[PDB]
């Protein structure tokens, strides 16, 4: 008999863990409190098995932060070694070398609930 692999909460997308209604509520509270900050959900890609699971899911980012800069923050938070491939994606595009302010990306790419969703993986495209 083979092992049966069980799935934890992280194995479930944030959108399935908290209802659409509750997510909307959470965004509108935090945007009222910090109008100059962007609410971001960062999760490991569902197919990614080599990079570790992040400790937290919900982040607040000052809106003048460049995307490429946010990518390095997350890379350090995961404590990756220099040779480990790492892509942080918004709407499946790599933000790794994107110099755009996150305020502008938020305008363009935020979800209906008001969060900006990002996913990380070992490649942008296989």
């Amino acid at each position: 008999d083979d092992f049966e692999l069980l799935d934890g909460p992280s194995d479930r997308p944030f959108k399935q863990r908290r209802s659409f209604a509750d997510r909307c509520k959470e965004v509108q509270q935090i945007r009222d409190q910090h109008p100059s900050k962007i609410p971001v959900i960062i999760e490991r890609y569902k197919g990614e098995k080599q990079l570790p699971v992040l400790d937290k899911t919900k982040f607040l980012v000052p809106d003048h932060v460049n995307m490429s800069e946010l990518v390095k923050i997350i890379r350090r938070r995961l404590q990756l070694n220099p040779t480990q491939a790492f892509f942080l994606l918004v709407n499946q595009h790599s933000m790794v070398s994107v110099s755009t302010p996150i305020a502008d990306i938020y305008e363009q790419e935020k979800d209906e609930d008001g969060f900006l969703y990002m996913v990380y993986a070992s490649q942008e495209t296989f």
Side-chain angles (χ1 to χ4, degrees), residues 71-100:
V71 177
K72 328 266 249 324
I73 293 173
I74 302 310
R75 208 190 177 275
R76 288 187 303 269
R77 196 182 184 96
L78 291 166
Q79 304 183 264
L80 306 187
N81 295 316
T83 51
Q84 295 185 255
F86 177 75
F87 292 81
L88 184 57
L89 314 174
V90 169
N91 193 37
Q92 21 254 49
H93 291 276
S94 176
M95 299 290 106
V96 174
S97 299
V98 176
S99 59
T100 307

Side-chain angles (χ1 to χ4, degrees), residues 14-15 18-20 22-28 30-31 38-42 57-60 106 109-118:
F14 179 75
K15 285 191 180 186
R18 297 285 279 159
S19 69
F20 179 78
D22 286 352
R23 292 182 268 116
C24 286
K25 166 183 193 160
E26 193 157 24
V27 166
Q28 294 162 37
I30 210 58
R31 286 283 288 181
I38 306 307
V40 184
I41 297 302
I42 303 177
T57 298
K58 292 186 299 206
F59 293 91
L60 271 186
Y106 185 63
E109 303 296 339
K110 65 176 160 64
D111 189 83
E112 175 67 36
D113 64 7
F115 277 107
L116 180 58
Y117 286 84
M118 308 181 174

Side-chain angles (χ1 to χ4, degrees), residues 16-75:
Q16 300 181 10
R17 272 152 45 208
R18 297 285 279 159
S19 69
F20 179 78
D22 286 352
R23 292 182 268 116
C24 286
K25 166 183 193 160
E26 193 157 24
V27 166
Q28 294 162 37
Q29 283 172 5
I30 210 58
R31 286 283 288 181
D32 178 74
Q33 192 169 329
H34 309 278
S36 67
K37 299 179 192 57
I38 306 307
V40 184
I41 297 302
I42 303 177
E43 306 181 283
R44 191 173 66 177
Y45 178 54
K46 68 187 72 150
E48 178 61 43
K49 298 314 183 177
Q50 300 298 320
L51 295 166
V53 175
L54 200 51
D55 59 315
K56 295 291 187 204
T57 298
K58 292 186 299 206
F59 293 91
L60 271 186
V61 185
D63 64 10
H64 56 272
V65 170
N66 284 0
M67 294 312 290
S68 55
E69 153 77 350
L70 176 54
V71 177
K72 328 266 249 324
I73 293 173
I74 302 310
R75 208 190 177 275

